[PDB]
Amino acid sequence: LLKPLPADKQIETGPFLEAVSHLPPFFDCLGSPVFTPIKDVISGNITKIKAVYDTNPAKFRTLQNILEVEKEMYGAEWPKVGATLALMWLKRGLRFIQVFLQSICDGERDENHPNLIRVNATKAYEMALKKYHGWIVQKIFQAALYAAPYKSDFLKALSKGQNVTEEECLEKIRLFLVNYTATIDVIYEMYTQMNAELNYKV
Amino acid sequence: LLKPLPADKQIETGPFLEAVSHLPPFFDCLGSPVFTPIKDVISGNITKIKAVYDTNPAKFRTLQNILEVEKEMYGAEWPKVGATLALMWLKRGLRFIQVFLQSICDGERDENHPNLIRVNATKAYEMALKKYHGWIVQKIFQAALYAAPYKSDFLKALSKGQNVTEEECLEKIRLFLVNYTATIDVIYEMYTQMNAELNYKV
């Protein structure tokens, strides 16, 4: 689980990186090599943030510190630079995972295709990522979607094989989502208040 | 350029890894982020081979040595294991690049779509990779193809911006292809003679 936010809503960079570093692996709950490239993309963002943090953990103590430091370090190349860029993209992958899991927990489904997770992934994609992809990457997403597992399998993949009902799994996901969602929200507000959000497409 | 093969047709592992390590970058002659994941896939194979070589460069002096050593090291998990696996997949990416470049040099083109390289890429894909992909990855290839550059641009990307005619570029590619193709051929023969080739799909 992620720490709760402190009253000052500052997010400590070290603890944050340690928590998010447990996310990429999970993509192998999706159960197909198609998603391995995605894990490495997310993992790349986390690496890049850590490599900058590691250079001066004090200067880069909080996520806010990264943005404001890099803003003065880089001038006109900022925010399309350094850890600020990497975190700009990491927050979008995190949000995808948040929206996807929340949509599953909220019982959203396609009533005639109940064992799939395609509607949940698509919603997650539309809310987190689609705005930032050109059509080639969108078509790539559409194709990749088909590699997505059955809901039943996914959930069983989430519970480390450990024998809990689907209902119990979802209750634990809901618990995870509280501090996760609040953390992602704070990162998005920081990007807004720093005018560090860019809208270019890949 | 790659060294020529020696009379014994053994391929020294160190020099081979150094030569192929100059290939991934080029994928950024394709001129779009869609191909960055592919670079990292190929680069991953080269890393994995090097990490095994590095452990005992003498024991792993040649590519042949890697296969025969791993065969006795691993038993029934071989050849779907270690550097033998990584090289099994690396040779396929290398072959793709060989067939693609050769097809371009041979003047193969779609006469009504002359400025594209799609026929060349597809041929390269059918000859090197398609057999080893399931349909999701094939559809992903089809979508990605659209990110491929114009022939004119690609060629200009290959000549480090340096101002040589297209004809001169192709002549240099043809020269590159001689030892490259002969090297890849030798690797494929080794996999055959070692019964190390596997046909599973991703």
Numbering used by the authors:
A (entry chain A), B (entry chain A): 8 to 209
From the paper:
Human glycolipid transfer protein (hsGLTP) forms the prototypical GLTP fold and is characterized by a broad transfer selectivity for glycosphingolipids (GSLs). In human GLTP, a glycolipid headgroup recognition centre located on the protein surface enables selective binding of the GSL head and ceramide amide groups via multiple specific interactions. To elucidate the structural dynamics of the GLTP–GSL dimer and associated adaptations, we comparatively analyzed nine novel crystal structures of wild-type GLTP (wtGLTP) and the sulfatide-specific mutants D48V and A47D/D48V complexed with N-lauroyl-containing monosulfatide (N-lauroyl-3-O-sulfo-galactosylceramide; hereafter referred to as 12:0 monoSF) and disulfatide (N-lauroyl-3,6-di-O-sulfo-galactosylceramide; hereafter referred to as 12:0 diSF) in different crystal forms and compared them with previously studied GLTP–24:1 monoSF complexes.
Because the double mutation A47D/D48V restores the open dimer conformation along with the local negative charge repulsion in the dimer, we also studied the crystal structure of the double mutant A47D/D48V complexed with 12:0 monoSF. Similarly, SF complexes with mutant D48V systematically deviate from those with wtGLTP or the double mutant A47D/D48V.
